[model samples]
Target chain A: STPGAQQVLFRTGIAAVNSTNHLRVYFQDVYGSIRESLYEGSWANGTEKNVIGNAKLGSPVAATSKELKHIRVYTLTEGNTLQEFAYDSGTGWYNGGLGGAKFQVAPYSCIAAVFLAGTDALQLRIYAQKPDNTIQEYMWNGDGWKEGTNLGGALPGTGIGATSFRYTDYNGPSIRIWFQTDDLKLVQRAYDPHKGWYPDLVTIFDRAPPRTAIAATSFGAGNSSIYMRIYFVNSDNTIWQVCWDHGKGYHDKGTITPVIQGSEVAIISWGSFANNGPDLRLYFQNGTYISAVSEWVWNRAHGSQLGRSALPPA
Target chain B: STPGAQQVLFRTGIAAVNSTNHLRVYFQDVYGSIRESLYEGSWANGTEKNVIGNAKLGSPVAATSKELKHIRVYTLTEGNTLQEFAYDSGTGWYNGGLGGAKFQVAPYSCIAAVFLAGTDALQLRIYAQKPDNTIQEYMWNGDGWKEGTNLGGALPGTGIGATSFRYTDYNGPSIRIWFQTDDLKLVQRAYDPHKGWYPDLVTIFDRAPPRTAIAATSFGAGNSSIYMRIYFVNSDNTIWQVCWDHGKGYHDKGTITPVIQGSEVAIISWGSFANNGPDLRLYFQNGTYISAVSEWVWNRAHGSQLGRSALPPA
Candidate 1:
């Protein structure tokens, strides 16, 4: 195995009655060697689908070339899972695709956002990367990627400076897109078959984006509806974020159900989210890294986060 | 007030929840009479948003000629709690534009379909017919509907027909035109928004010639998925039905944990259905009159129907 992680956390295919069927979720570091099998089910804390596999992802989508760092595949089952798989860029894993073209197999409901260097510029597509780690490509065709059609558009760059960041689809066509190019803004793209061949365009978070990490158990289904949490830096350098739910579609920041937020935060990729049901996870930023915090529906802000407050007329 | 048996199940201003919210389900009759209030929480499901006033509903759409009949509206809930109000066209309710101008409100989640068309033909538009009889019309820029942007492809005849039919974006710049004529053949006329407008000459159904009596849901938010449940007449003349949950985008059928089919029989839509949250319901001609059935997953067929066989797992 090429540069495998120390530990694994992905679930095998065995689940129990009162179990969260979650495995381990991890990936390869940006360098592709430092595979991080971050958390385990017990330590993971949330519920539903646990990923744990190819982390350091790359897209062979440069209008120039397609050198996806290394594609890998992992199986799922009941609980404690196989953290990232044995790093093998080429192979005859389970789903035997072409031999050498070893690209990571995107989980069923994982979040995927791709920014590719088209023939001219950078084209972005954000969608629930299917189990097959293909592009899930969304181009910006002429007329704004007409609905029901996968299309693409022009972008700023067409070179290596361009990259894609996928957290997890949380089970929706709507996934918050965030890139710290300058300011902190949540980005989103929907899939409209009528439009382009890919997901819709980028919808920058206005304010409240989901603050909780989503899962299949808590979320719903792969490519269904979605709730997202995006944490990044602001112009004033203040680290504030928000959240949204099926209740509000997509907001910039968190609302009464305020999403995860903090002052000194760090985010590196994200933990794996699942389908099967609804699962909300709170996160803490460690500057280029994201960890867990307490989760709640919320009561107020600018204060210590606590468990959900009781409702009235109970 | 008009018909003796027509009880006011609900009234206008009852549909407060919009496409942006989750389904607010309930049950109703063909005549727009409500059964139960599926909204468990009071004052708008008794959630944080204590929406007090009546929702927008109980109104009829207007037609240029004949009295309007058979109308449909987007709901925002699930289960028997079908509470979202839709526009009625059978009566003069609300005038809509003129004539009779009066409408009655009611529960509809688990109810039958109803619409009266002595002659005129009115098209569904980018508007939210609230439970309170208020029509929240979105902006439209000549080409296609503007608001419910997610809503794509329109149609001419209702899917509730007796023969095969095709549906296309009836209203749009590059509108599409598709249908099935006699001999069970599908036809179409679609215009690509990007390629410019084409009254899209008539064309055949991309997949098949066609079937009849298709029941479909619109591309509205919340319950915003497009579905076309078509009815097929067998050699014996017994009607058979199937559905298309527009893949998943405009029609996200979601992963279903179906209730085993006890009867080993498929229940075709007595008509079309919409997702009131987890509940998917529609009417079909059981006998002479219409009736409605519900499923948790919007695009379920053999599984969703309630029966004994679903005991072991669920």
Candidate 2:
């Protein structure tokens, strides 16, 4: 018998679930079917479980719902539709996909499920590409799924990355998406209830090479003038991040280190995990297989970048 | 029109021969490029032929000589490189740049070709990137093809990953390679009858987080002990592995199951198939793909992970 390691899946989504952050991972087994492993005990050291046994899934997502056992996960089923799987205190795991609409999804489709403005409604949003690589948006409210609205842009398959935040300050919560344009620049577009999609796609980082994976996240919780940040892996495999504050516009925080090749950046923000101040943590391949999670926080004593290490455990 | 699983192209180079394994997959396609489907024969199912069609390729690799009517595939014709594509009845696949020198490779710059090692040369040796991450070595045996001297370190694009084997144990074989140093830690130095590249830059994984996608394989076959081992996502989606012999090293039996987000690993090994005491078969998702191949063998015992799986059935 081979000296086998514990089964660890690829993290698909990461989110803050009631204080502790939960990491969701998805992988195909000997069967092409999908399985999920979730870790939530802690950031560095956490217990993991294969929550979803086997399901036909595509581009899965995780979100906190407004319920007692609020850990909810969703994916496109075999029929190219939505299927919700979640953990319930009493029942454990269940799929809430029955009666859902039969919505077809293009390849490389990305979906994000988040709590809406008031926190009472849980909605699912999707951003995917068409044959010509144009961006299309879809929404799944309580009743049905709505889609097919092009946002007017083209990207290669799997060229877009996005995140939604309940930015408590700016009038309401919004969605910020950053994607590689045909020309290779990383541009961002935001959503607002009063203004709709931003009039112009803001260039978060004008230097991103072609086909770079762009991921965005907001720093801090309770959202007091949170910092809007965007990240991407440079051609050299080093990660570079840029940020924007309420009064201060976009700030480029050049190359973050210990470059992890061939991995897209996955990030999650929590209140103050290590207590330095508004812990902004990011996870990417430390090398090719494992991952290194780097926490970026500012010193409470002096406003400067603290937690400068990016290397993960031995 | 068939139950086609999505227009998957950009092949990581899967092959189809007359082995117990009838499937071969590559990444890319559509608008009529190339794809093969094998449901089985009338006994199990049937198969389909996707004779490579019109396609746009970047770093296409293909090779197959010396066996049946070895099928060979080639990619885009930029860079003046031969960009060979071939599959062997004895050897799996080889993509060597011939005649053409200074040919630029896009993303996957790594490649290997069958070399006349000894005389009847039952051995396979490869000369690839020197640690500074440049394709610094090339040998077509007394043939002609020389890359310039190593250029210090680094590249403007992605680094590379490749494995070579001088399977001297069974018959004769060996493997070695090098890639980007910034974050990609897969490294090695090599020596041929004429040249040798030095020894600098070890590994970042002494402290690399758990679970990284490190895949490897070897050449020249027989019912003998061929060194072809790949390490990738395990059942837990953790990085799992099974090696050849003790001297084969790469024995990290410790499971890094906490899974890094994205980057599924895909692997292929060529050696004695079906009979010769369980063929060494394994695979995984490289990036933006699905591959789950595990062969369950047991004259010795189907009670174990025997026939655990074949490949994702079409």
The most accurate candidate by DockQ is: 2
Q: Of the native A-B interface contacts, what share survives in model 1?
A: 0.00
Give interface RMSD, every candidate, in order.
27.4, 13.1
Q: Give the Cα lDDT of each candidate.
A: 0.25, 0.44
Query: How many residue pairs in model 1 have overlapping backbones?
Result: 182
Per-prediction CA RMSD (Å): 26.4, 16.7
Winner by TM-score: 2
DockQ of each: 0.01, 0.06
Superposition TM-score, candidate 1 onto the true structure: 0.23
What C-alpha root-mean-square deviation, in Å, does candidate 2 show against the real structure?
16.7
Off by over 4 Å in 1: A1-23, A27-41, A44-99, A102-186, A192-202, A206-242, A251-278, A282-314, B1-314
The native-contact fractions of the candidates, in order shown, are 0.00, 0.06
- Where is model 1 chain A poorest over a 10-residue stretch in terms of lDDT? A8-17
